[PDB]
């Protein structure tokens, strides 16, 4: 539930999330993808 701006902010089917505690936006990447935007495949684990 992030603004239109951060729409498509997270890659590889990750979900953007608003951390009210820090007043920031972060990504909840799916298992196997790392990076601030889930941009990198975790090559050192599984395919």
């Amino acid at each position: 539930e992030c603004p239109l701006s951060h729409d498509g902010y997270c890659l590889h089917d990750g979900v953007c999330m608003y951390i009210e505690a820090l007043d920031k936006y972060a990504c909840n990447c799916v298992v196997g993808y790392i990076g601030e935007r889930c941009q990198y495949r975790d090559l050192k684990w599984w395919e």
Binding site: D7, A26, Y40, R41
Partner: protein, 614 residues
């Protein structure tokens, strides 16, 4: 301990990797047994319970330490001695401990960082840590450098009270936790005036060597706890021993036996083969725009260009592209005529469907042909996406070398994963200097498990992770195997041009079955399994061979005339000679060329004046 075990470090900031467990598991896999964190130490979303004991073995973090959004109650970063702050969190802090509370306002309680004595660069940030105890009593003027304490923003709110007090022995009530062991060990603001850097005690006899970071166990250059700059084996150096020293007496340069090379933050005896060795005596990753990379008998060296040096293209993730995470429709302009990417290449999905977040239009697949000029890549090649209509990695058709001076996650120099191609097509790849190669998740990809990678590698430990592709049995089933002309060395595709090494011989960039010696239209000769056409002035011998070299000097018989050793098409008629005298020749019986009479200015169709009528 001599050297230490290192981990790459994370760089996800506030990002959560999967579910709390997943996340924690990723954190665990990364920092397990790690003693030195080359990158960053981000501990986030660590829930209650959860054993964070593996952190105890972390002694130094190069980048920054992030501790935010943790409901866990304790973090044993006790052995952490120094935070270099090679990078910052939010452009300020080398250490940022943020909002570590549960929904019930009870999370991070104890942070026993009792050995954290040095923070080379950056500030410190504490905020919203309801359960944090004792840390509020630390004199950070000793841990942090004066230059940054102006940016230091940190206040502790103890609206609970489950905290204890510091052992009466603790200096000025400074403690990271209970017990006598958690008393802040000041080694900065307790030093006498004669002290240059840190110190063991207050007496001048305890002064630490100039090049010590967190303190020392003795005055000497070897008694340091952590090096502040460079590490030359046993001792800490400010500057690695020069290869050559200046001689004050002879006003010349002398060779230095103690001479070492500058690799990273350590002083080595020689540079890694894949790195560039400069005259100074230091291993680098690139040469100034003033020069190129000239291999010098076995070591990559830098000289100078004889004018306008070839364009050097910075790879994605560096310099002009530090922000961009994938070659895209926008930045692709700066890769036009590149022959050597001086960095990394990231071809990601987002680049193709376009990114709305970074305001970049979708990449036109037709424009990947730009890279067809790329010859070598000093860093790594990452390709997580690729045009579907394309069956081949065409763009990198002429890629010859991957140096892997940098690798992704610090391990892989070539990563072709999650693609849809049916063939690699890197028929020019002849060397992967360093880094592992991972090629997996490519549904219908063949030939991949046929390459003799042991030939392209050039460093100890280079592994190859090739899994979950097109079944080998399936590849051979649909007749998608290596061409018959392909040597056991492997193949980059089905075609005879995709061979790693040739069976018999080769026509330039293609493997064949034999050279055209006795037959074939263009006559050739064989040297080094290569077929080169003889000089056209050679007569196609229907019996034996045709020639034994490139130049006409090796023809068995000329097709026309013969001017001495060399076989010529037509006898010389205007060639400059001696005394500014023109040269004219005529063919005779055996089509042999001979000098005409010096009188014949218009040449002569025969010997003497009786050969040039009027």
């Amino acid at each position: 301990l001599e050297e230490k075990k290192v981990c790459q470090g994370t760089s996800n900031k506030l990002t959560q990797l999967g579910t709390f467990e997943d996340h924690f598991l990723s954190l665990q896999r990364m920092f397990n047994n790690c003693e030195v964190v080359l990158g960053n130490l981000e501990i986030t979303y660590v829930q209650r319970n959860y054993d964070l004991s593996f952190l105890k073995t972390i002694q130094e973090v190069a980048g920054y330490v992030l501790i935010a959004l943790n409901t866990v109650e304790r973090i044993p970063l006790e052995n952490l001695q120094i935070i270099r702050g090679n990078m910052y969190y939010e452009n300020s802090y080398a250490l940022a401990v943020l909002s570590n509370y549960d929904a019930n306002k009870t999370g991070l309680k104890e942070l026993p960082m009792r050995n954290l004595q040095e923070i080379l660069h950056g500030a410190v940030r504490f905020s919203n840590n309801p359960a944090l105890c004792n840390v509020e009593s630390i004199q950070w003027r000793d841990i942090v450098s004066s230059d940054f304490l102006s940016n230091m923003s940190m206040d502790f709110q103890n609206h609970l009270g489950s905290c204890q007090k510091c052992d009466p022995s603790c200096p000025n009530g400074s403690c990271w936790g209970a017990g006598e062991e958690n008393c802040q060990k000041l080694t900065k603001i307790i030093c006498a005036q004669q002290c240059s850097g840190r110190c063991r005690g207050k007496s001048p006899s305890d002064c630490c060597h100039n090049q010590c970071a967190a303190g020392c166990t003795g005055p000497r250059e070897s008694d340091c706890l952590v090096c502040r700059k460079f590490r030359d084996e046993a001792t800490c150096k400010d500057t690695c021993p020069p290869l050559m020293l200046y001689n004050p007496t002879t006003y010349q340069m002398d060779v230095n036996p103690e001479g070492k090379y500058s690799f990273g933050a350590t002083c080595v005896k020689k540079c890694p083969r894949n790195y560039v060795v400069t005259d100074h005596g230091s291993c680098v990753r690139a040469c100034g725009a003033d020069s190129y990379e000239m291999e010098e008998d076995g070591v990559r060296k830098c000289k100078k260009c004889e004018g306008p040096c070839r364009k050097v293209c910075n790879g994605i993730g560096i310099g002009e592209f530090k922000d961009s995470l994938s070659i895209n429709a926008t930045n692709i302009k700066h890769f036009k005529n590149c022959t050597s990417i001086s960095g990394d290449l990231h071809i990601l999905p987002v680049a193709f469907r376009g990114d709305s977040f970074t305001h970049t239009p979708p990449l036109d697949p037709q424009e990947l042909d730009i890279l067809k000029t790329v010859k070598e890549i000093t860093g790594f090649l990452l390709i997580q996406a690729w045009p579907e209509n394309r069956t081949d990695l065409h763009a990198f058709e002429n890629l010859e070398i991957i140096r892997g001076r940098t690798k992704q996650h610090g391990q892989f120099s070539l990563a072709v994963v999650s693609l849809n191609i049916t063939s690699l097509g890197l028929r020019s790849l002849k060397e992967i200097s360093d880094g592992d190669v991972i090629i997996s998740g490519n549904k219908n990809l063949c030939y991949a498990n046929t390459i003799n990678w042991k030939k392209l590698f050039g460093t100890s430990g280079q592994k190859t992770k090739i899994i979950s592709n097109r079944g080998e049995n399936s590849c051979k089933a649909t007749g998608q195997v290596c061409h018959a002309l392909c040597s056991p060395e492997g193949c980059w595709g089905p075609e005879p041009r995709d061979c790693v090494s040739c069976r018999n011989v080769s026509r330039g960039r293609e493997c064949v079955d034999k050279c055209k010696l006795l037959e074939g239209e263009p006559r050739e000769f064989v040297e080094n399994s290569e077929c080169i056409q003889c000089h056209p002035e050679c007569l196609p011998q229907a019996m034996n061979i045709t020639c034994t070299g490139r130049g006409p000097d090796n023809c068995i018989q000329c097709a026309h005339y013969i001017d001495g050793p060399h076989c010529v098409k037509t006898c010389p008629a205007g060639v400059m000679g001696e005394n500014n005298t023109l040269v004219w020749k005529y063919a005779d019986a055996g089509h042999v060329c001979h000098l005409c009479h010096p009188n014949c200015t218009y040449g002569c169709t025969g010997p003497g004046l009786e050969g040039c009528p009027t």
